Design a protein around this ligand. Structure first.
Ligand SMILES: C[C@H]1O[C@H](O[C@H]2[C@H](O)[C@@H](O)[C@@H](O[C@H]3[C@H](O)[C@@H](O)[C@H](O)O[C@@H]3CO)O[C@@H]2CO)[C@H](O)[C@@H](O)[C@@H]1N[C@H]1C=C(CO)[C@@H](O[C@H]2O[C@H](CO)[C@@H](O[C@H]3O[C@H](C)[C@@H](N[C@H]4C=C(CO)[C@@H](O)[C@H](O)[C@H]4O)[C@H](O)[C@H]3O)[C@H](O)[C@H]2O)[C@H](O)[C@H]1O
Length: 680
């Protein structure tokens, strides 16, 4: 349609086309362009980013002479003058950090935040020394143990760290532990969080809260047969019962809190210190959780702030303030839960480091927030609520995906001098050695879909990749937190080189590391700057893959409505399996007595081991192993593009930690894989 619309869309950073996952160009419709535009909101710029050790030109506009003052983060001052319409160079050898430049003419001043960044993200010494490391990538909620309350928690993480470290592992990788909704416990996707600044309180180990043990009331309640029976049903279930587990924990912790609240000691001081230091961000998280709890008491279907009375939808309204003043103790309780979660996760980090693990804990940062959570309640202007983030139609998801997450407006991120991005990294790089960036292509572009539409109606919107990658490297170095990018799906060629030279580690998924005729890449040909995995939480387990269970189940759940396309996927899987089997034999991961014809073979321990040896033998500096594959599990934990159709984020591991680490087979497998890492 019109050129007005086309130019406008282009000026807004909306791509008029893109290369799809099959390599074919696709065009964006005028309707999409219109709907997405509707969704979006002087002498020097407000922010400038530079790489350290390079020249730093600053262009000045206007006219006449300007005086300038640059104050570094540590407080060093530099002065000069420059003519409007000219450029000047910043003082040489500025240190990396966050600096302030101010230009003045007559009375009025203009400020530029000046960011000086290293080129590469952080790497631990072990990796710099060219060691090949391994770790366990787990979904925390899936872990079973003798002590947990029916969901894997921070106590399980702590116990597991020791078992991984004793066997030569260097890290435990986690799903996102962002705050979800204790008032709607069944909204359990870690990737639709309330806020990416705070933590999921369901992971609190209540056994480790002293005040739980000191409460007479709590212990009388814990001792009830009813309580013990509810607990045993929750623990025995093969699927996490989020409602029961949350009620158990909230009930217990509320009684613990009544005890803690009367303390006048170091513990109380530490909690208050913590609260004072974290400031408004923490306060508003707690206020959100207290309000949400009250609202679901009035009506359980009140899922987030858009379903609340208008008076509570505006975070700044006088009755929100009144609610907070009248429910000071409820707000206090939710502050306390963030303190406990924080403290317990910190204890896990400390233990990982006591065990000399080069990475220790590997956190995950989700690519967005839920529309009706605390983050959007607090800073509505930042998010484009009339669009949703997803992914375009692709090979294994031909309908595409709509994740329902309102995207950050890229112009507001830069207009705030990257503050929201910076704070996100500071929150998520604490108490860990590596951070996974979910859907790392987001640094360059996100698939925005008009609200309420199917994914095929979306388009790619531009983000300022060069600035974001520099800032990421800077924050990585300052936290000594390495960065691993999930660069999977429909990936723009432009970003691949930039991620590499920024020192971001790629994911190499065994299933996909083959060419156009299913010849699999040799283990020695895996790039060093990557993590090799057999699979992820978004993909079938080894057994599921082999059995084509993902395709069969996907079909049943509505993911593959085109039979011809589906038939193609089955055919390609059988070809892939054969190519994989050939490679396992070719590079010495299977004995000669193992079968050579994939169609006549089922998943066996020999094959299971062979597949994991193949990636253990690779040149990838990191290896991520799933416990589900040590246990030979068939069922997936998550099916992308489903919400209600499958019990996502619920499938428990089939054995406790205690039982898995006493199993001869598991112990032999991990010893073998660890020896292959140290030989490669
Ligand atoms: C699942 C992955 O998909 C894409 O990569 C895939 C790709 O699609 C596939 O073809 C395949 O590509 C392969 C390809 O097959 C191969 O031939 C090629 O050679 O190589 C490719 C790999 O490079 O593999 C990739 C990696 O898995 C992506 O590029 C990748 O980044 C993503 N992984 C990560 C990203 C997210 C982001 O959230 C997570 O998604 C997860 O969380 C989402 C949000 O909770 C989940 O969304 C669900 O829940 C939402 C609430 C729900 N939304 C509703 C709810 C609400 C309110 O509540 C409303 O507002 C909405 O309007 C409503 O519709 C969503 O509809 C539903 O889909 C999602 O299903 C789940 O997977 C993943 O776990 C994470 O690891």
């Amino acid at each position: 349609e019109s050129k007005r619309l086309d130019n406008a869309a282009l000026a807004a950073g909306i791509s008029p086309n893109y290369i799809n996952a099959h390599g074919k160009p696709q065009s964006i419709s005028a309707e999409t362009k219109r709907r997405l535009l509707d969704a979006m909101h002087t002498p020097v710029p407000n922010v400038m980013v530079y790489t350290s050790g390079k020249k730093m030109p600053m262009v000045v506009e206007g006219s006449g002479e300007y005086s300038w003052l640059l104050t570094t983060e540590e407080g060093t001052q530099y002065k000069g003058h420059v003519t409007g319409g000219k450029a000047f160079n910043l003082p040489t050898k500025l240190p990396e950090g966050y600096h302030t430049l101010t230009l003045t003419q007559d009375d009025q001043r203009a400020h530029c935040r000046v960011i000086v960044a290293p080129k590469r993200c952080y790497e631990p010494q072990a990796l710099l020394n060219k060691q090949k490391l391994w770790g366990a990538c787990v979904q925390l909620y899936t872990l079973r143990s003798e002590k947990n309350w029916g969901i894997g928690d921070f106590g399980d993480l702590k116990a597991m760290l020791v078992d991984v470290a004793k066997r030569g592992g260097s890290f435990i990788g986690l799903n996102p532990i962002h705050a979800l909704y204790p008032a709607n416990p069944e909204s359990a996707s870690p990737y639709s969080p309330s806020s990416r600044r705070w933590l999921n309180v369901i992971y609190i180990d209540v056994n480790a809260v002293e005040d739980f043990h000191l409460s007479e009331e709590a212990q009388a309640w814990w001792q009830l047969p009813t309580t013990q029976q509810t607990l045993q049903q929750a623990r025995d279930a093969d699927w996490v019962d989020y409602s029961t587990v949350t009620a158990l924990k909230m009930t217990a912790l509320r009684m613990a809190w009544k005890g803690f609240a009367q303390r006048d000691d170091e513990q109380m001081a530490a909690f208050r210190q913590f609260v004072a230091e974290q400031g408004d961000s923490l306060f508003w998280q707690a206020a959100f959780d207290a309000l949400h709890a009250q609202q679901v008491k009035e009506d359980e279907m009140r899922w987030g702030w858009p379903a609340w009375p208008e008076m509570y939808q505006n975070v700044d309204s006088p009755e929100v303030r009144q609610f907070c003043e009248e429910h000071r103790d409820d707000v206090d309780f939710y502050l306390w839960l963030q303190w406990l979660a924080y403290s317990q996760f910190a204890a896990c980090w400390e233990i990982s480091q006591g065990y000399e693990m080069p990475i220790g804990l590997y956190r995950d940062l989700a690519v967005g927030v839920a529309e009706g959570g605390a983050e959007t309640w607090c800073d509505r202007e930042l998010y484009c609520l009339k669009a949703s983030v997803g992914a375009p139609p692709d090979i294994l998801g031909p309908l595409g995906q709509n994740w329902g997450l309102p995207p950050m407006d890229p112009h507001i991120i830069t207009a705030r001098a990257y503050e929201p991005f910076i704070e996100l990294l500071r929150a998520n790089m604490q108490n860990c050695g590596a951070l996974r960036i979910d859907h790392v292509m987001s640094m360059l572009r996100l698939w925005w879909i008009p609200y309420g539409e199917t994914a095929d109606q979306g388009a790619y919107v531009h983000y300022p990749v060069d600035d974001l990658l520099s800032i990421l490297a800077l924050e990585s170095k300052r936290h000594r937190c390495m960065v691993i990018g999930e660069d999977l799906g429909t990936v723009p060629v432009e970003i691949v080189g930039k991620l590499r030279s920024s020192g971001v580690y790629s994911y190499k998924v065994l299933y996909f590391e083959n060419d156009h005729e299913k010849t699999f890449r040799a283990p020695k040909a895996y790039p060093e700057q990557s993590m090799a995995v057999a699979a992820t939480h978004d993909l079938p387990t080894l057994r599921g893959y082999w059995e084509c269970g993902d395709l069969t189940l996907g079909k049943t759940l509505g993911l593959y409505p085109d039979e011809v396309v589906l038939r193609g996927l089955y055919q390609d899987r059988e070809l892939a399996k054969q190519g994989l089997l050939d490679a396992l034999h070719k590079y010495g991961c299977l004995p000669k007595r193992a079968g050579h014809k994939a169609s006549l073979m089922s998943m066996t321990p020999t094959l299971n081991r062979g597949l994991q040896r193949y990636i253990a033998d690779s040149n990838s500096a990191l290896l991520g192993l799933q416990p589900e594959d040590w246990l030979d599990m068939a069922e997936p934990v998550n099916i992308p593009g489903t919400s209600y159709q499958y019990k996502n984020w619920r499938r428990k591991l089939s054995a406790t930690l205690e039982s898995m680490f006493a199993d001869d087979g598991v112990n032999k497998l991990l010893k073998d894989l660890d020896r292959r890492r140290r030989s490669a």
